């Protein structure tokens, strides 16, 4: 469970596909469930399963609706319609999907009072009771989870539409109108010369002096929009589930001795770590003992905000970015994380390729060898 937790957390840091990162940290949360089962926390593992299933369905359906929205402007190719690089600035276009994705992210970043916060910090406390090394790994994973989830959210909803951004995309320019910039004297499909571009229309720069040996398309304003209501209604229901399903493992309106719904449901339940403490937790007291998990999650969120929030956001200070000028593309930073993390995430942790190199091809050869012994 803890190995799966660390691998799934570290494999979703530098992904460009939204669904692949969703799968990888789904694997991470399942590893968390198995880690809780490893210490004998039956009720805690079932609580995390209940909360994570609803939050995961919410996030996956939101991502699918958003991919459906983007497919009208980038096409139906999943290499383009699931790329978070070309996906920024969708807050203005899909607001309901934005709220659903944000709620799922906050739930699975361990932020109160959402669903998975209670289950996750119960798991972390039980793991600290279990062993300190596992607790260290799990808390670092919680911070990493906050980082890559808000990385996904900022890459996918905040900023500008990178596919339709006029900084890069030359198709959505102002030169394709019949209105010419200079006046009523410009027309015709122009065919230029690199020499003219080199002299910069400042004739005096003619020193090369030799060699070394498209309109009519028409453009319209297209914007992504929210999907149909049949897609939106389960998103609303899953928003309600994500908001109000964490109260089945926590006591709802505790007044003295009160057992929650889940512990009354699982009245005979294995609990190896807390086999002697019949304690009743409190709704407004658990956020006091969960300062560490929320602090590490907020540290990861701060890192994600520094990395991926837009320049026009008030939370991003100009002086702090100036301190991160990194002039000279400092090689001490480039191969410390960025190259290593990107190669780890892109190569899928190098296990799968090994499974191709060692097992798959090998078994193929074995098959041929057996066929040879059956033929000659």
């Amino acid at each position: 469970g803890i190995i799966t937790v660390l691998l799934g957390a570290t494999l979703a840091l530098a992904q460009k596909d939204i669904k692949r990162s969703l799968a990888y940290y789904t694997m991470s949360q399942l590893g968390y469930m198995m880690l809780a089962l490893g210490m004998g926390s039956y009720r805690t593992a079932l609580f995390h399963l209940i909360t994570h299933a609803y939050s995961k369905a919410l996030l996956f359906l939101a991502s699918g609706s958003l991919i459906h929205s983007m497919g009208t402007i980038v096409g139906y190719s999943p290499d383009k319609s699931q790329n978070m690089v070309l996906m920024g600035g969708l807050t203005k276009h899909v607001p309901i999907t934005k709220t659903s994705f944000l709620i799922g992210t906050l739930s699975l970043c361990g932020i109160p009072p959402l669903a998975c916060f209670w289950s996750k910090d119960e798991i972390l406390n039980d793991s600290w009771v279990y062993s300190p090394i596992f607790a260290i790994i799990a808390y670092f994973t919680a911070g990493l989870t906050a980082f890559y989830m808000f990385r996904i959210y900022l890459l996918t909803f905040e900023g500008h539409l990178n596919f339709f951004c006029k900084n890069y995309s030359g198709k959505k320019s102002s030169s394709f109108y019949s209105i010419s910039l200079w006046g009523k004297k410009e027309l015709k499909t122009i065919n230029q010369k690199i020499s003219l571009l080199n002299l910069l229309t400042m004739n005096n720069k003619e020193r090369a002096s030799f060699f070394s040996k498209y309109f009519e398309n028409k453009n319209i304003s297209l914007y992504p929009y929210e999907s149909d209501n049949t897609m939106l209604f389960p998103l609303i229901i899953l928003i309600m589930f994500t908001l109000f399903v964490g109260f089945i493992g926590i006591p709802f309106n505790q007044e003295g001795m009160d057992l929650d719904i889940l512990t009354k449901w699982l009245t005979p339940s294995i609990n190896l770590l807390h086999s002697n403490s019949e304690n009743f937790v409190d709704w407004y007291e658990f956020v006091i003992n969960a300062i560490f998990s929320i602090s590490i999650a907020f540290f990861g969120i701060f890192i994600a905000f520094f990395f991926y929030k837009p320049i026009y956001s008030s939370l991003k200070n100009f002086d702090l970015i100036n301190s991160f000028d990194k002039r000279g593309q400092k090689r001490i930073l480039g191969d410390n994380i960025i190259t290593i993390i990107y190669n780890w995430s892109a190569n899928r942790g190098y296990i799968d390729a090994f499974y191709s190199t060692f097992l798959i091809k090998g078994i193929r050869s074995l098959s041929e060898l057996v066929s040879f012994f059956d033929r000659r």
């Binding site: 339709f164 006029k166 900084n167 910039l181 000028d325």
Partner: protein, 300 residues
């Protein structure tokens, strides 16, 4: 007022209107972006593009003050002012299906024909100047299309895209539409030609710089050219406005610092393309062209 009626009978179209609030031309497009341009002088007093997807998502860009101050003002002075007392007259207007609009103003100065073309596109606005020489002697002139961009607060106002470009502390070119005098901007560290290393130019302090290649560097085959695009970032209302320079070879950037408290509550800067360090020569029969474009990606 009869001039306004004549202009309505001659040039009015879908998106082009003429009012008397001095005659002014109102340019409008399909999504609701609006632009006010005075006709007595080539002064753009208001640019309100649609940046939010609400029913009233039009946000004012230019900092405009009474008595014809601020905004976008074409300046054309000779060094070897040609717009003072000019009689600007509308030549013709053009339109692309209520999606884009355009208006041309014609003026004469000595033997020079000056055309100011102001156009609206659904996410951008363009201002171009074309001067044609008809005399028997070549001229040497300077020019600058200076725009006063309004920011919500002094902090959180910056410029992105001028990293690595050498900047010289130089006084802004004197214009009839100044908010701050060239002397009160501390004019310029005089000609230090420092190379900017930070990625964002912070405009909370009083600065007056020109971003361009040095005039000594411009005589070589390959040199670091003046950047063509640079964005103004406003964290007060989360707006990034991109400025594109063509024809000009300099970018004037000026900020007032504390002086912005005198003229109002909202901050402002004065930025735009310019040709100041190296005067531009025009032979007889030639033509010089320059243009400033303000776009925005806030709709996407």
């Amino acid at each position: 007022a009869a001039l306004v009626e004549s202009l309505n009978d001659q040039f009015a179209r879908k998106g082009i209107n003429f009012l008397e609030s001095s005659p002014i031309v109102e340019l409008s497009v399909r999504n609701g972006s609006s632009l006010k341009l005075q006709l007595s002088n080539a002064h753009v007093t208001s640019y309100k593009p649609k940046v939010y997807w609400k029913d009233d998502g039009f946000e004012e860009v230019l900092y405009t003050l009474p008595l014809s101050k601020g905004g976008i003002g074409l300046v054309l002075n000779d060094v070897t002012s040609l717009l003072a007392g000019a009689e600007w007259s509308v030549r013709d207007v053009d339109s692309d299906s209520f999606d884009a609009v355009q208006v041309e103003l014609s003026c004469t100065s000595g033997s020079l024909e000056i055309t100011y073309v102001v156009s609206l596109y659904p996410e951008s606005m363009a201002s171009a100047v074309l001067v044609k020489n008809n005399g028997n002697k070549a001229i040497g002139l300077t020019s600058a299309i200076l725009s006063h961009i309004q920011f919500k607060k002094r902090s959180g106002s910056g410029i992105q895209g001028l990293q690595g470009c050498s900047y010289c502390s130089h006084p802004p070119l004197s214009s009839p539409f100044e908010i701050v005098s060239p002397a009160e901007a501390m004019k310029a560290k005089l000609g230090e030609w420092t190379t900017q290393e930070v990625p964002i130019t912070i405009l909370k302090n009083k600065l007056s710089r020109v971003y361009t290649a040095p005039p000594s560097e411009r005589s070589k085959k390959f040199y670091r050219t003046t950047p063509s695009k640079y964005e103004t970032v406003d964290q007060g209302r989360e707006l990034v406005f991109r400025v594109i320079r063509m024809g000009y070879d300099d970018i004037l950037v000026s900020s007032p610092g504390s002086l912005s408290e005198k003229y109002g509550r909202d901050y402002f800067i004065c930025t735009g393309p310019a040709s100041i360090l190296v005067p531009v020569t025009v032979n007889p029969g030639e033509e010089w062209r320059g243009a400033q474009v303000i776009e925005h990606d806030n709709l996407t």
